Subunit: 172 residues, 2 copies
Amino acid sequence: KCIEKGIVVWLTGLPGSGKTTIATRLADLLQKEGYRVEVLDGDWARTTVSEGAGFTREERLRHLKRIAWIARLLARNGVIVICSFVSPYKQARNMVRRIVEEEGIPFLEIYVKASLEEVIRRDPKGLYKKALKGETDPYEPPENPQLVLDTESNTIEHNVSYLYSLVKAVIE
Amino acid sequence: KCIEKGIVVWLTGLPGSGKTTIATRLADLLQKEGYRVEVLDGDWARTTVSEGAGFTREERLRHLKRIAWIARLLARNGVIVICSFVSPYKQARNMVRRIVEEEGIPFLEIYVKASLEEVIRRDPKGLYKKALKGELENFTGITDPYEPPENPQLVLDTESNTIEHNVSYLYSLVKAVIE
């Protein structure tokens, strides 16, 4: 398919909330339909555009602005860009939104909601190793997310379906 | 317009050689013909994707590798990516080429040729302003001897030919490659 303008889908939520799997399944659906799609996540970024440590808030902010700009270039060239980043800070996410919206590109902020208690209770191993590896910063939910995907009340498939519906309502 | 895969046109040369003027004029030509085009240059990068980097040789590399990836992503989605950056080192440019070619994307290294004395002579006012405000270490013409490409896909002699002749010459190579 050859659409003039794409969109930016921003998945924000706690690590372990299952953001990437949702992003991944969404991408498969859209690609199968002929859409140009790019999934951008921290794993990818760490080795490519954001390689070079930095966990200071100044650094993460520079990292997020960079992602925002990359999503803006791709979407303005017809790509559906799906971003999966914890992006815990509201102000940071709002800065990302403005960069994308300045281009006239739709910015769909998706809150992938999971409970902090449940995420740590199911992964004591990971918490422990993050403690050993050098891991105070509370997650700030969106004030106006275009969608909230409750990963605990619904199945991954129904959540993917909810997101796919919104995407199509926007791009079709 | 719609093409399956784009290309990466990498302009390399000394600051002041005319790289960016060439990039923009070429970009204007292709867009007017309906192609999806993005011009990536240092001034843009400096306030966006590479906004807070120093200028150490390792810092510049991180930056160039980053540009190579952004270019690769755009190009694999049908975009003609025209790049104009300060990349005096062959190794650095070879690393950029590798990243692009890996995706199977054509990488055209264009040498915008102008001597060091020539770019200095061209812009006295500019030399003085960077020096007076201490924003040198950027004018790599001296701080980092430029290493010409061993085998560029094209050479644009900015001393012998006009910008019109050169933009037109680059445009023919680009059109020959994108079909």
